[PDB]
Amino acid sequence: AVSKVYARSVYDSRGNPTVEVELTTEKGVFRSIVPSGASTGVHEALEMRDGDKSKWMGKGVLHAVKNVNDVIAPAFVKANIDVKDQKAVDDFLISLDGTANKSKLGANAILGVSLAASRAAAAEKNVPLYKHLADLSKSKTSPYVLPVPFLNVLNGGSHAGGALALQEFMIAPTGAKTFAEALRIGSEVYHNLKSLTKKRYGASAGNVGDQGGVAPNIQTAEEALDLIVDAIKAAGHDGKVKIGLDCASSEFFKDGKYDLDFKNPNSDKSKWLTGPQLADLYHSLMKRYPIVSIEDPFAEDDWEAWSHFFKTAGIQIVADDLTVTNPKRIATAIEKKAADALLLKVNQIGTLSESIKAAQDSFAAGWGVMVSHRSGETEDTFIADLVVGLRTGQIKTGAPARSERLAKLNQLLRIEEELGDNAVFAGENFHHGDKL
Amino acid sequence: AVSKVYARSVYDSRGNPTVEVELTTEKGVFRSIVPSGASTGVHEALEMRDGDKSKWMGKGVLHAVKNVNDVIAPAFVKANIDVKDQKAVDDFLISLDGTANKSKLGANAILGVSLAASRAAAAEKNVPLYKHLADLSKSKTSPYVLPVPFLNVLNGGSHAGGALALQEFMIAPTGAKTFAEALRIGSEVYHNLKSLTKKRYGASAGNVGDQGGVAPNIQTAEEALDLIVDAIKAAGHDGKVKIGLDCASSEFFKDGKYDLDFKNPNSDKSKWLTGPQLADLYHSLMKRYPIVSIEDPFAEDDWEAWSHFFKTAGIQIVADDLTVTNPKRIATAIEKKAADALLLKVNQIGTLSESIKAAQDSFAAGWGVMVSHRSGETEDTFIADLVVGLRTGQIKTGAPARSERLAKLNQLLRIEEELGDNAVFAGENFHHGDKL
Ligand SMILES: [Mg+2]
Ligand SMILES: [Mg+2]
Ligand SMILES: [Mg+2]
Ligand SMILES: [Mg+2]
């Protein structure tokens, strides 16, 4: 039984406040922390901020923490909920809020409770978190599936300097034999990329972006990609490392068109592209580089562009801001055949149950699922256990730098070690890892 | 009763492998992770690295991990040692090694066991880690003392781009009334610094260094300091935030001279300053800026230079590479009156006991003690509990960015909350928090 629910303000990887929740039962104290994105989709559940300019640059989460201690906490404890019944836990929270976008209490007030409950439940059942998460999602645990790590080693986009339009340039060691090998390979390629970057762009270009990757002032994606390929070869891993991209095109979508130089206040409007035009650029890159996944190639509501492209894509197309981990929007994407993979962010929807539902609906449509972190992370490692529990076979949780990223990668090392031969590495089968 | 000692490889904040140890008792499994420095003093205890340039860039810790599972673990379990008796735990580890620098098993093999044992001990005693650390060190606990955080918000030095010689430019919110307020104030100054840095040196200059601070291409300490002071003021905290520096001068000490532009090959040897000349520069910075602490102003063995400067320093002078948390070198420093504050790094010496002894000898000499992280950190939060347990009143664990730094700051927030009226904030008394 839950004897206490408590929330406090903690700081995320960018130094901004965020919500941390502790749930107390007879088994102890279970803590979960809520992450925060930067390029947040317009349809994401509401992240409640105080807006007090005289404090934390106006990014305090006092209202959210208060919503947990003064509203959720008393009602939750009184309800005497069974933490093992994740569905009941979340139906209560969703009803308590009473809004579709969780704007009354705030998604960042609700999620912490939702996640902490699952941890308390796992301890009650006397099983590790990933196992409990497999049960909740009715996932196969014989054997488990380890995910291929998609490491964002080179950063571009809105909050990542330069003129580079595309947000993320990830490497995926699909050729590795184990997760531990994939991670070692990833670290070697990353270190080789830092040395090459520092030499070609200056020592300063060695500093990292929010997610841990280098962020040199590069102009075109071609330049970045050619640089990544040199790193893979210099590191001696040619043939084992593939590439994944997160375009986050919603960030440069204006007047129904795409500005690939949006970080330039004097961008040439006659240079902005239409959906069909942008698609042609993607195809050109896809033919020159070992790209096996493309995320948010088009705007969060530009359905036509997604459908047109998917027609001749040929590779995994990941929906992030388009679907915002929302089953309702996912059903639409399926019907319109806009993509074949879901980027799963628990904080985009607000509860563990809704996230699991989103995953299940995706796997049912033959879609893949890549569990994801947010640009603003914490020392919390929930997604590591989640990606294993959901048996997706693919996760992106940062470059192999900055511990809000390494914390998840290390947890996967422990889970892998603990499972032994009771688990397999998704490798080249990352897309349909759930079907292994 | 310890039934198992185990070690594995995990990644630090720079993506380099490091040692993680778990100790199993009837109370459960306790994990501790070993940190790693970059500007390591020549006298530090040995950090055993594999040296296989084909794996992890040659930074593997397979040998150290093996020594834990193959040499340490077997004998430790058989000895049936009492985890509460920290001194007994460390005498065994030190004796098993046999070398004066822990070069047989490696300091990174011994430390993990030393720390994990203390966590297990606190569990057996059913008390918070900081409480058990206070007992081990015989420190006052009525009331507890929370530290002022020295946040390295602007980085330079060897492992940073640019030409800035000094390694760390820290801010310390001594004017705050609680640790929570100090952290908020620090986060605010940090963010104002970020925007200002990007506005002057370019958006790309917003990327962070290994310790989370901005690392723009700055030529002189004055330019860096003026920038920090502009941030403090823009944030509205003028007068409440002081400055601390880590020169790490051993990094640019050549031919008995100090090169303030050692990062440039064609550096004019004519500009190299002598011991007395470097001192004049420091006094100059001290009268111009609100600097309340200077670390490693002179080389790790340049004793006379330290003694001469200290005669008229007027502020806290911290020893890092000079003393390397070694009681024997601390004694020499005291006798020579070279400094009045010790930077305490548990991995510079190798065990918790020796670290505790170093702190005790320091306080007995009227010295201050600043607990410190390494440039290569992890999700481990041991030093948060250590600084509170030692009642020092001051710690440096990074800028308020990158979770290997925030993990510690967040842990201090939890400690402060738990203690309530039973703890006080060091504030302007940071130098002698132990006397509060
Ligand atoms: Mg986004
Ligand atoms: Mg995205
Ligand atoms: Mg150093
Ligand atoms: Mg130092």
Side-chain angles (χ1 to χ4, degrees), chain A residues 6 8 11 13-16 20 56 184 188 191 207-208 215 217 379 400 402-404 406 410 414 417, chain B residues 6 8 11 13-16 20 31 56 184 188 191 204 207-208 215 379 400 402-404 410 414 417:
Chain A
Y6 182 77
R8 65 171 63 83
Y11 292 76
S13 60
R14 270 188 287 247
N16 293 137
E20 171 168 287
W56 290 294
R184 175 176 64 72
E188 278 164 33
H191 290 142
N207 301 168
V208 307
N217 296 307
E379 56 273 36
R402 296 182 67 131
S403 295
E404 67 268 19
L406 287 308
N410 290 338
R414 304 190 189 98
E417 167 195 299
Chain B
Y6 181 70
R8 71 172 65 82
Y11 296 72
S13 61
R14 275 188 285 246
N16 291 147
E20 173 168 287
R31 182 185 305 155
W56 290 297
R184 172 174 62 74
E188 280 165 17
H191 294 308
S204 194
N207 296 163
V208 301
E379 52 268 44
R402 297 182 65 138
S403 291
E404 66 265 18
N410 286 340
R414 300 189 191 92
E417 174 196 293

Short mmCIF file of all heavy atoms in Angstrom, two decimals, chain A residues 6 8 11 13-16 20 56 184 188 191 207-208 215 217 379 400 402-404 406 410 414 417, chain B residues 6 8 11 13-16 20 31 56 184 188 191 204 207-208 215 379 400 402-404 410 414 417:
data_model
loop_
_atom_site.label_atom_id
_atom_site.label_comp_id
_atom_site.label_asym_id
_atom_site.label_seq_id
_atom_site.Cartn_x
_atom_site.Cartn_y
_atom_site.Cartn_z
N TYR A 6 5.28 12.23 -2.69
CA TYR A 6 5.97 13.50 -2.50
C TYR A 6 6.72 13.94 -3.75
O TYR A 6 7.30 13.12 -4.45
CB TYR A 6 6.98 13.36 -1.36
CG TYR A 6 7.73 14.64 -1.02
CD1 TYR A 6 7.12 15.66 -0.29
CD2 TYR A 6 9.06 14.81 -1.41
CE1 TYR A 6 7.82 16.82 0.05
CE2 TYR A 6 9.77 15.97 -1.08
CZ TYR A 6 9.14 16.96 -0.35
OH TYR A 6 9.83 18.10 0.00
N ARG A 8 9.45 17.08 -5.46
CA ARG A 8 10.39 18.17 -5.20
C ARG A 8 10.98 18.68 -6.51
O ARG A 8 10.85 18.03 -7.56
CB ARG A 8 11.55 17.68 -4.30
CG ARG A 8 12.44 16.61 -4.96
CD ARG A 8 13.70 16.31 -4.12
NE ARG A 8 13.38 15.74 -2.81
CZ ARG A 8 13.13 14.46 -2.58
NH1 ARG A 8 13.17 13.58 -3.57
NH2 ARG A 8 12.82 14.06 -1.35
N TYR A 11 17.22 19.55 -10.71
CA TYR A 11 17.70 20.16 -11.94
C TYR A 11 18.03 19.13 -13.02
O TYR A 11 18.57 18.06 -12.72
CB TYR A 11 18.95 21.01 -11.65
CG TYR A 11 18.68 22.25 -10.82
CD1 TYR A 11 18.48 22.16 -9.44
CD2 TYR A 11 18.60 23.51 -11.43
CE1 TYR A 11 18.19 23.30 -8.69
CE2 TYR A 11 18.31 24.65 -10.67
CZ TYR A 11 18.10 24.54 -9.31
OH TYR A 11 17.80 25.66 -8.57
N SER A 13 19.70 18.13 -17.04
CA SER A 13 21.01 18.27 -17.68
C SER A 13 21.37 19.65 -18.23
O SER A 13 22.54 19.92 -18.54
CB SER A 13 21.15 17.22 -18.79
OG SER A 13 20.16 17.37 -19.78
N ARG A 14 20.37 20.52 -18.37
CA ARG A 14 20.61 21.88 -18.87
C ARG A 14 20.61 22.90 -17.73
O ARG A 14 20.79 24.10 -17.95
CB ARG A 14 19.55 22.28 -19.90
CG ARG A 14 19.90 21.93 -21.35
CD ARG A 14 18.87 22.53 -22.32
NE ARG A 14 17.60 21.82 -22.27
CZ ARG A 14 17.10 21.08 -23.27
NH1 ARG A 14 17.77 20.97 -24.40
NH2 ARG A 14 15.94 20.45 -23.12
N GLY A 15 20.40 22.43 -16.51
CA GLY A 15 20.38 23.33 -15.37
C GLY A 15 19.02 23.96 -15.12
O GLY A 15 18.91 24.94 -14.37
N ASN A 16 17.99 23.41 -15.74
CA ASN A 16 16.63 23.91 -15.55
C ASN A 16 15.89 22.97 -14.61
O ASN A 16 16.07 21.75 -14.66
CB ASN A 16 15.88 23.98 -16.89
CG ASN A 16 16.47 25.02 -17.83
OD1 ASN A 16 16.62 24.77 -19.03
ND2 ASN A 16 16.79 26.19 -17.30
N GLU A 20 10.55 15.80 -9.61
CA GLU A 20 11.01 14.51 -9.10
C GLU A 20 9.95 14.06 -8.10
O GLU A 20 9.50 14.84 -7.26
CB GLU A 20 12.37 14.63 -8.40
CG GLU A 20 12.79 13.36 -7.65
CD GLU A 20 14.25 13.38 -7.20
OE1 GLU A 20 15.14 13.25 -8.07
OE2 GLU A 20 14.51 13.55 -6.00
N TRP A 56 14.53 31.31 -11.91
CA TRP A 56 14.89 30.27 -12.87
C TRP A 56 14.61 30.65 -14.32
O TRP A 56 14.18 29.81 -15.12
CB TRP A 56 14.14 28.97 -12.54
CG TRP A 56 14.59 28.28 -11.27
CD1 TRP A 56 15.81 27.71 -11.03
CD2 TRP A 56 13.80 28.05 -10.09
NE1 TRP A 56 15.82 27.13 -9.79
CE2 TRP A 56 14.61 27.32 -9.19
CE3 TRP A 56 12.49 28.38 -9.72
CZ2 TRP A 56 14.14 26.91 -7.93
CZ3 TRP A 56 12.03 27.97 -8.47
CH2 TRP A 56 12.86 27.25 -7.59
N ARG A 184 30.85 -0.07 -27.03
CA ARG A 184 32.28 0.20 -27.13
C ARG A 184 32.59 0.81 -28.50
O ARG A 184 33.31 1.81 -28.60
CB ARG A 184 33.12 -1.08 -26.94
CG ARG A 184 34.63 -0.84 -27.17
CD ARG A 184 35.50 -2.07 -26.89
NE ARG A 184 35.23 -3.18 -27.80
CZ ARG A 184 35.57 -3.22 -29.08
NH1 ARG A 184 36.22 -2.20 -29.64
NH2 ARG A 184 35.27 -4.29 -29.82
N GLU A 188 34.23 4.53 -29.47
CA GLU A 188 35.44 4.68 -30.28
C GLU A 188 35.19 5.59 -31.49
O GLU A 188 36.01 6.46 -31.80
CB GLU A 188 35.95 3.30 -30.74
CG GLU A 188 36.79 2.58 -29.68
CD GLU A 188 36.97 1.10 -29.96
OE1 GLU A 188 37.03 0.71 -31.15
OE2 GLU A 188 37.07 0.32 -28.99
N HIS A 191 34.91 9.21 -30.15
CA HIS A 191 36.18 9.82 -29.79
C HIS A 191 36.98 10.17 -31.04
O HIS A 191 37.67 11.18 -31.08
CB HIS A 191 36.95 8.87 -28.86
CG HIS A 191 36.33 8.76 -27.49
ND1 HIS A 191 36.28 7.57 -26.79
CD2 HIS A 191 35.74 9.69 -26.72
CE1 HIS A 191 35.67 7.79 -25.63
NE2 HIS A 191 35.33 9.06 -25.56
N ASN A 207 33.80 21.09 -28.00
CA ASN A 207 32.76 21.24 -26.98
C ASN A 207 31.49 20.53 -27.46
O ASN A 207 31.25 20.46 -28.66
CB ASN A 207 32.51 22.72 -26.71
CG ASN A 207 33.76 23.44 -26.23
OD1 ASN A 207 33.81 24.67 -26.18
ND2 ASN A 207 34.78 22.68 -25.87
N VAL A 208 30.69 20.02 -26.54
CA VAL A 208 29.48 19.28 -26.91
C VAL A 208 28.15 20.03 -26.79
O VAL A 208 28.01 20.98 -26.00
CB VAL A 208 29.36 17.98 -26.08
CG1 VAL A 208 30.63 17.16 -26.19
CG2 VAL A 208 29.07 18.32 -24.61
N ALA A 215 29.32 19.86 -32.11
CA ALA A 215 28.44 20.78 -32.82
C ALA A 215 29.23 21.84 -33.58
O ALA A 215 29.07 23.04 -33.33
CB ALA A 215 27.48 21.44 -31.84
N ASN A 217 30.44 24.35 -36.61
CA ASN A 217 29.65 25.20 -37.51
C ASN A 217 29.66 24.64 -38.93
O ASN A 217 30.36 25.16 -39.80
CB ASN A 217 30.20 26.63 -37.53
CG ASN A 217 30.09 27.32 -36.18
OD1 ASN A 217 29.01 27.37 -35.59
ND2 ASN A 217 31.20 27.86 -35.70
N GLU A 379 19.50 12.11 -14.16
CA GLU A 379 20.20 10.89 -13.77
C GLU A 379 19.26 9.67 -13.74
O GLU A 379 19.69 8.54 -13.45
CB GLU A 379 20.89 11.06 -12.41
CG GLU A 379 20.00 11.48 -11.22
CD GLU A 379 19.84 12.99 -11.10
OE1 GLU A 379 19.77 13.68 -12.14
OE2 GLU A 379 19.76 13.49 -9.95
N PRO A 400 27.69 9.14 -26.59
CA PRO A 400 28.30 8.50 -25.43
C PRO A 400 29.10 9.52 -24.62
O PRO A 400 30.28 9.33 -24.35
CB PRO A 400 29.18 7.43 -26.06
CG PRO A 400 29.63 8.12 -27.33
CD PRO A 400 28.36 8.73 -27.84
N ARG A 402 28.29 12.83 -21.43
CA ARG A 402 27.36 13.50 -20.50
C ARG A 402 26.61 12.37 -19.81
O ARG A 402 25.92 11.59 -20.47
CB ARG A 402 26.38 14.42 -21.24
CG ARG A 402 27.05 15.59 -21.96
CD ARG A 402 26.06 16.52 -22.66
NE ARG A 402 25.19 17.24 -21.71
CZ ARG A 402 24.96 18.55 -21.74
NH1 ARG A 402 25.54 19.31 -22.66
NH2 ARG A 402 24.14 19.11 -20.86
N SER A 403 26.72 12.29 -18.49
CA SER A 403 26.11 11.19 -17.75
C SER A 403 24.58 11.05 -17.74
O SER A 403 24.06 10.02 -17.32
CB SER A 403 26.65 11.17 -16.32
OG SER A 403 28.04 10.86 -16.34
N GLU A 404 23.86 12.07 -18.20
CA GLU A 404 22.41 11.92 -18.25
C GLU A 404 22.16 10.95 -19.42
O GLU A 404 21.09 10.37 -19.55
CB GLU A 404 21.69 13.27 -18.48
CG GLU A 404 21.93 13.92 -19.85
CD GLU A 404 23.10 14.88 -19.87
OE1 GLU A 404 23.95 14.79 -18.95
OE2 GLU A 404 23.17 15.72 -20.80
N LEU A 406 25.00 8.60 -20.50
CA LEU A 406 25.69 7.37 -20.10
C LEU A 406 24.93 6.58 -19.03
O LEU A 406 25.02 5.35 -18.96
CB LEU A 406 27.12 7.66 -19.60
CG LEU A 406 28.22 8.05 -20.60
CD1 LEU A 406 28.27 7.01 -21.73
CD2 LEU A 406 27.98 9.43 -21.17
N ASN A 410 24.72 2.67 -19.38
CA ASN A 410 25.33 1.82 -18.36
C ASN A 410 24.28 0.86 -17.81
O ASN A 410 24.56 -0.33 -17.59
CB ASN A 410 25.92 2.65 -17.22
CG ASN A 410 27.16 3.42 -17.63
OD1 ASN A 410 27.84 3.07 -18.59
ND2 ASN A 410 27.47 4.47 -16.87
N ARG A 414 24.20 -3.35 -17.44
CA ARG A 414 23.85 -4.14 -16.26
C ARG A 414 22.73 -5.12 -16.58
O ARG A 414 22.78 -6.29 -16.18
CB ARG A 414 23.43 -3.24 -15.11
CG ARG A 414 24.47 -2.20 -14.72
CD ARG A 414 24.13 -1.48 -13.42
NE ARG A 414 25.03 -0.35 -13.20
CZ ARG A 414 24.75 0.91 -13.50
NH1 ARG A 414 23.57 1.21 -14.03
NH2 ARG A 414 25.65 1.86 -13.30
N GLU A 417 24.14 -7.91 -18.69
CA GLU A 417 24.94 -8.79 -17.86
C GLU A 417 24.06 -9.69 -17.00
O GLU A 417 24.33 -10.89 -16.85
CB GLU A 417 25.86 -7.96 -16.97
CG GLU A 417 26.53 -8.72 -15.84
CD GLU A 417 27.11 -7.77 -14.80
OE1 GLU A 417 28.01 -6.98 -15.16
OE2 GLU A 417 26.67 -7.82 -13.64
N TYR B 6 32.09 -7.63 -6.56
CA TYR B 6 32.10 -7.70 -8.01
C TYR B 6 32.39 -6.36 -8.68
O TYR B 6 32.01 -5.30 -8.18
CB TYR B 6 30.74 -8.22 -8.50
CG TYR B 6 30.64 -8.35 -10.00
CD1 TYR B 6 31.36 -9.33 -10.68
CD2 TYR B 6 29.82 -7.50 -10.74
CE1 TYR B 6 31.27 -9.45 -12.07
CE2 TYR B 6 29.73 -7.61 -12.13
CZ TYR B 6 30.45 -8.59 -12.78
OH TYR B 6 30.38 -8.71 -14.15
N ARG B 8 32.74 -4.26 -12.72
CA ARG B 8 32.44 -4.27 -14.15
C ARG B 8 32.87 -2.95 -14.77
O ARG B 8 33.19 -1.98 -14.07
CB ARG B 8 30.93 -4.47 -14.38
CG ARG B 8 30.05 -3.27 -14.01
CD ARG B 8 28.60 -3.46 -14.46
NE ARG B 8 27.94 -4.57 -13.78
CZ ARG B 8 27.39 -4.49 -12.57
NH1 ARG B 8 27.40 -3.35 -11.90
NH2 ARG B 8 26.83 -5.56 -12.02
N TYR B 11 30.83 3.47 -18.38
CA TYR B 11 31.38 4.67 -18.99
C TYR B 11 31.22 5.94 -18.15
O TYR B 11 30.19 6.14 -17.50
CB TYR B 11 30.75 4.88 -20.36
CG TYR B 11 31.07 3.79 -21.36
CD1 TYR B 11 30.51 2.51 -21.23
CD2 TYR B 11 31.98 4.01 -22.40
CE1 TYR B 11 30.84 1.49 -22.11
CE2 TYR B 11 32.32 2.98 -23.29
CZ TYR B 11 31.75 1.73 -23.14
OH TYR B 11 32.10 0.72 -24.01
N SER B 13 31.52 10.36 -17.83
CA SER B 13 30.95 11.48 -18.55
C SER B 13 31.63 11.86 -19.86
O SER B 13 31.09 12.63 -20.65
CB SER B 13 30.89 12.71 -17.64
OG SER B 13 32.18 13.08 -17.22
N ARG B 14 32.84 11.34 -20.09
CA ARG B 14 33.55 11.62 -21.33
C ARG B 14 33.46 10.41 -22.28
O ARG B 14 34.02 10.42 -23.38
CB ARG B 14 35.03 11.94 -21.07
CG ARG B 14 35.31 13.40 -20.72
CD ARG B 14 36.81 13.69 -20.66
NE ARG B 14 37.42 13.14 -19.46
CZ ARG B 14 37.94 13.87 -18.48
NH1 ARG B 14 37.93 15.20 -18.56
NH2 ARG B 14 38.45 13.28 -17.41
N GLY B 15 32.76 9.38 -21.83
CA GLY B 15 32.61 8.18 -22.65
C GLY B 15 33.82 7.27 -22.57
O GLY B 15 34.06 6.47 -23.47
N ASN B 16 34.58 7.40 -21.49
CA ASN B 16 35.75 6.57 -21.28
C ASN B 16 35.39 5.56 -20.20
O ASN B 16 34.70 5.90 -19.23
CB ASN B 16 36.94 7.41 -20.81
CG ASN B 16 37.47 8.34 -21.90
OD1 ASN B 16 37.93 9.44 -21.61
ND2 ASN B 16 37.41 7.89 -23.15
N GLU B 20 33.35 0.09 -11.81
CA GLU B 20 32.15 0.12 -10.98
C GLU B 20 32.19 -1.16 -10.13
O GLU B 20 32.39 -2.25 -10.65
CB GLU B 20 30.89 0.13 -11.85
CG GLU B 20 29.60 0.00 -11.05
CD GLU B 20 28.36 0.28 -11.87
OE1 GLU B 20 28.11 1.47 -12.19
OE2 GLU B 20 27.63 -0.67 -12.21
N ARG B 31 26.49 -0.25 -4.81
CA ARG B 31 27.30 0.13 -5.96
C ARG B 31 28.03 1.46 -5.81
O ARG B 31 27.47 2.44 -5.34
CB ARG B 31 26.39 0.18 -7.19
CG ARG B 31 27.05 0.50 -8.51
CD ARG B 31 25.97 0.62 -9.58
NE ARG B 31 25.13 -0.58 -9.64
CZ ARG B 31 23.88 -0.61 -10.09
NH1 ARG B 31 23.29 0.50 -10.52
NH2 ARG B 31 23.20 -1.74 -10.10
N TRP B 56 38.80 1.13 -26.84
CA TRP B 56 38.54 2.30 -26.00
C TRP B 56 39.65 3.35 -26.07
O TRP B 56 39.90 4.06 -25.10
CB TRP B 56 38.35 1.85 -24.55
CG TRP B 56 37.08 1.08 -24.29
CD1 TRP B 56 35.80 1.54 -24.44
CD2 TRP B 56 36.97 -0.27 -23.82
NE1 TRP B 56 34.90 0.56 -24.10
CE2 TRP B 56 35.59 -0.56 -23.71
CE3 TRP B 56 37.91 -1.26 -23.48
CZ2 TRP B 56 35.12 -1.81 -23.28
CZ3 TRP B 56 37.44 -2.51 -23.05
CH2 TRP B 56 36.05 -2.77 -22.95
N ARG B 184 19.84 27.75 -7.03
CA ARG B 184 18.98 28.49 -7.96
C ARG B 184 19.77 29.69 -8.50
O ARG B 184 19.83 29.92 -9.71
CB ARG B 184 17.69 29.00 -7.29
CG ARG B 184 16.86 29.95 -8.18
CD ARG B 184 15.50 30.36 -7.59
NE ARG B 184 15.60 31.10 -6.34
CZ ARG B 184 15.99 32.37 -6.22
NH1 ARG B 184 16.32 33.08 -7.29
NH2 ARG B 184 16.05 32.93 -5.02
N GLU B 188 20.91 30.49 -12.38
CA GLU B 188 20.54 31.74 -13.04
C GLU B 188 21.74 32.50 -13.61
O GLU B 188 21.68 33.03 -14.72
CB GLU B 188 19.77 32.62 -12.07
CG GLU B 188 18.30 32.23 -11.93
CD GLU B 188 17.63 32.86 -10.73
OE1 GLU B 188 18.18 33.84 -10.17
OE2 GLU B 188 16.54 32.37 -10.33
N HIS B 191 22.92 30.59 -16.72
CA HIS B 191 22.14 30.81 -17.94
C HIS B 191 22.36 32.19 -18.54
O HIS B 191 22.38 32.34 -19.77
CB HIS B 191 20.65 30.61 -17.67
CG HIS B 191 20.29 29.19 -17.32
ND1 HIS B 191 20.67 28.13 -18.12
CD2 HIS B 191 19.62 28.67 -16.28
CE1 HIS B 191 20.24 27.01 -17.57
NE2 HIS B 191 19.60 27.30 -16.45
N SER B 204 27.71 29.07 -31.49
CA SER B 204 28.49 27.86 -31.30
C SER B 204 29.26 27.89 -29.98
O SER B 204 29.55 26.85 -29.39
CB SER B 204 29.46 27.67 -32.47
OG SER B 204 30.00 26.36 -32.48
N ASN B 207 28.28 25.82 -26.59
CA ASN B 207 28.57 24.42 -26.26
C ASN B 207 29.39 24.37 -24.98
O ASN B 207 30.14 25.30 -24.67
CB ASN B 207 29.33 23.76 -27.41
CG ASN B 207 28.51 23.70 -28.69
OD1 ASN B 207 29.05 23.50 -29.78
ND2 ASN B 207 27.20 23.86 -28.56
N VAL B 208 29.27 23.28 -24.23
CA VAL B 208 29.97 23.15 -22.96
C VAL B 208 31.22 22.28 -22.96
O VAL B 208 31.40 21.41 -23.82
CB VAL B 208 29.03 22.60 -21.87
CG1 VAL B 208 27.83 23.53 -21.71
CG2 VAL B 208 28.57 21.20 -22.24
N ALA B 215 32.96 27.21 -22.94
CA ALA B 215 34.39 27.21 -23.23
C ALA B 215 34.71 28.02 -24.49
O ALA B 215 35.30 27.50 -25.43
CB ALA B 215 34.90 25.78 -23.39
N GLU B 379 27.40 8.89 -12.69
CA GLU B 379 26.12 9.07 -12.03
C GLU B 379 26.23 8.86 -10.52
O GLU B 379 25.25 9.02 -9.79
CB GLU B 379 25.06 8.12 -12.62
CG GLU B 379 25.47 6.65 -12.66
CD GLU B 379 26.12 6.27 -13.98
OE1 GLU B 379 26.98 7.02 -14.47
OE2 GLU B 379 25.78 5.20 -14.52
N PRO B 400 26.36 23.95 -13.28
CA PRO B 400 25.02 23.37 -13.13
C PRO B 400 24.52 22.85 -14.48
O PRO B 400 23.40 23.15 -14.91
CB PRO B 400 24.19 24.55 -12.64
CG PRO B 400 24.79 25.69 -13.42
CD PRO B 400 26.29 25.43 -13.28
N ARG B 402 25.08 19.16 -17.24
CA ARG B 402 25.58 17.80 -17.41
C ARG B 402 25.27 17.06 -16.11
O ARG B 402 25.75 17.44 -15.04
CB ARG B 402 27.09 17.78 -17.68
CG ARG B 402 27.49 18.48 -18.97
CD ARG B 402 28.98 18.43 -19.25
NE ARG B 402 29.48 17.07 -19.48
CZ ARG B 402 30.36 16.74 -20.42
NH1 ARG B 402 30.84 17.68 -21.23
NH2 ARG B 402 30.76 15.49 -20.57
N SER B 403 24.46 16.01 -16.20
CA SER B 403 24.03 15.28 -15.01
C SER B 403 25.08 14.60 -14.12
O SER B 403 24.75 14.17 -13.01
CB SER B 403 22.92 14.30 -15.39
OG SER B 403 21.75 15.02 -15.73
N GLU B 404 26.32 14.50 -14.58
CA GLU B 404 27.33 13.90 -13.71
C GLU B 404 27.63 14.96 -12.66
O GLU B 404 28.20 14.67 -11.60
CB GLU B 404 28.61 13.53 -14.49
CG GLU B 404 29.36 14.73 -15.04
CD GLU B 404 29.00 15.05 -16.47
OE1 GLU B 404 27.95 14.58 -16.96
OE2 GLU B 404 29.79 15.79 -17.11
N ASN B 410 21.79 17.72 -6.92
CA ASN B 410 20.43 17.27 -6.62
C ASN B 410 20.43 16.47 -5.32
O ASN B 410 19.51 16.59 -4.50
CB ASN B 410 19.88 16.41 -7.77
CG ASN B 410 19.50 17.22 -9.00
OD1 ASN B 410 19.30 18.43 -8.92
ND2 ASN B 410 19.37 16.55 -10.15
N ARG B 414 18.36 16.97 -1.69
CA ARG B 414 17.62 15.96 -0.94
C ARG B 414 18.11 15.91 0.51
O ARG B 414 17.31 15.84 1.45
CB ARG B 414 17.78 14.58 -1.60
CG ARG B 414 17.27 14.51 -3.05
CD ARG B 414 17.23 13.09 -3.59
NE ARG B 414 17.01 13.04 -5.04
CZ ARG B 414 17.98 13.02 -5.95
NH1 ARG B 414 19.25 13.03 -5.57
NH2 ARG B 414 17.69 12.98 -7.25
N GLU B 417 16.81 18.91 2.43
CA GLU B 417 15.39 18.74 2.72
C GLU B 417 15.17 17.80 3.89
O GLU B 417 14.39 18.08 4.80
CB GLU B 417 14.70 18.19 1.47
CG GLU B 417 13.24 17.82 1.66
CD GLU B 417 12.75 16.93 0.54
OE1 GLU B 417 12.66 17.42 -0.61
OE2 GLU B 417 12.46 15.74 0.80
#
